[PDB]
Amino acid sequence: CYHGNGQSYRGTFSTTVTGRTCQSWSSMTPHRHQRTPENYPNDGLTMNYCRNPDADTGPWCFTMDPSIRWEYCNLTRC
């Protein structure tokens, strides 16, 4: 679990809500994006971990599902 909007979340959980696997923020595969550790160095954008680099309402991620752009992660607001 995370606190607030999980802005501070820097945990190693990477499974979407639907049991789908989180894509690595570095990788442009399958979802091509700009939320990179490279564009946002102080965000926690490590590997495929779940983060909220964007003032979302909980920690989310880009999905390894070519069909699913992104989703929240299977976490709970501590």
Curated annotation (Swiss-Prot):
N- and O-glycosylated. The N-glycans are complex biantennary structures present in either a mono- or disialylated state. The O-glycans are mostly (80%) represented by the monosialylated core type I structure, NeuNAcalpha2-3Galbeta1-3GalNAc, with smaller amounts of disialylated and non-sialylated O-glycans also detected. Glycans are attached at residue 74. It comes from the Eukaryota. Changing residue 70 to R: Loss of lysine-sepharose binding. Residues 1-78 form the Kringle domain. Disulfide bonds join 1-78, 22-61, 50-73. Apo(a) is the main constituent of lipoprotein(a) (Lp(a)). It has serine proteinase activity and is able of autoproteolysis. Inhibits tissue-type plasminogen activator 1. Lp(a) may be a ligand for megalin/Gp 330. Apo(a) is known to be proteolytically cleaved, leading to the formation of the so-called mini-Lp(a). Apo(a) fragments accumulate in atherosclerotic lesions, where they may promote thrombogenesis. O-glycosylation may limit the extent of proteolytic fragmentation. Homology with plasminogen kringles IV and V is thought to underlie the atherogenicity of the protein, because the fragments are competing with plasminogen for fibrin(ogen) binding. Disulfide-linked to apo-B100. Binds to fibronectin and decorin. Belongs to the peptidase S1 family. Plasminogen subfamily. This is Apolipoprotein(a). It comes from Homo sapiens. The lineage of its organism: Eukaryota, Metazoa, Chordata, Craniata, Vertebrata. The chain holds residues 1616 to 1693 of 2040 of the full protein.
